[PDB]
């Protein structure tokens, strides 16, 4: 789960507002989460994996064992069940509640970390590189 | 658990350096710990708690249930365990790594919130107000 380690930054967005937008995330968060440029902090400790995500928005953290569902509260403040797996190179997330559901895959693409966030047909694309 | 609710500041340290020596936090930790002045961040959400914590020395989070034991990445970088608990109006927090342990007590006074920090006898006192 090493490929993921590091820290990364942000450098393309697209589609981020329609995802939000799916998600059910209000104008005003909206309007300051598609501002950020966020670094993204990747460590591993033992089985244990952490990533940290520091925006102008907000700093969050999960703390999290592969394949261990946690309960997170999201940076947009949504309290949800989340799952995340490793699955042939992509570190996946599933996040629940409310009866509904997201996906949120991240992998590495040649320099660069992936993240693809679908919801009902809705995907988001977010690029990083290391920092 | 609500009384602690809210967003907190540093306001005064105390015998932080030694309870840093104590834990086994290194020199250029401790150089940097003792002089952040965090946030403190604390919130509810049904179940969930959520204390973040925000410094130039570093942004973290964690988020439990109240006497559900979790993994935890501290801010120094140990792997523990943590549990926490309510005790009669104080937040308690035990965390246990490498044979060792370690009491975190936030407690309100008057105004104030105040983290009080023991392992072998050394304790830190580091209280916050209202930002
Ligand atoms: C701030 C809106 C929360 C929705 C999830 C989205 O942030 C995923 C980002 C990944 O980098
Ligand atoms: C940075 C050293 C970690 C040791 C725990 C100490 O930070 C507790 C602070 C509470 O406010
Ligand atoms: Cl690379
Ligand atoms: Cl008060």
Redesign the pocket.
Same mark, same amino acid.
């Given at each position: 789960c090493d490929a993921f380690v590091g820290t990364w930054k942000?450098v393309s967005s697209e589609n981020?507002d329609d995802?939000?937008k799916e998600?059910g995330?209000g104008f005003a $968060?909206?309007k300051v989460?598609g501002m950020a440029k966020?670094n993204?902090i990747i460590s591993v400790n033992g089985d244990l994996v952490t990533i940290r995500?520091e925006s102008t928005?907000?700093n969050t953290e999960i703390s999290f064992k592969l394949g261990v569902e946690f309960d997170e509260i $999201?940076?947009?403040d949504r309290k949800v069940k989340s799952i995340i797996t490793l699955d042939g190179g992509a570190l996946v997330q599933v996040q629940k509640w409310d009866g509904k559901s997201?996906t949120?895959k991240r992998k590495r693409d040649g320099d660069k970390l992936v993240?693809e966030?679908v919801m009902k047909g809705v995907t988001?694309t977010?690029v990083?590189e290391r920092a």
């Open positions: 942000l981020f995802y939000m998600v995330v $968060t909206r989460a966020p993204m995500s928005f907000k $999201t940076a947009d997201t949120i993240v966030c988001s977010r990083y």
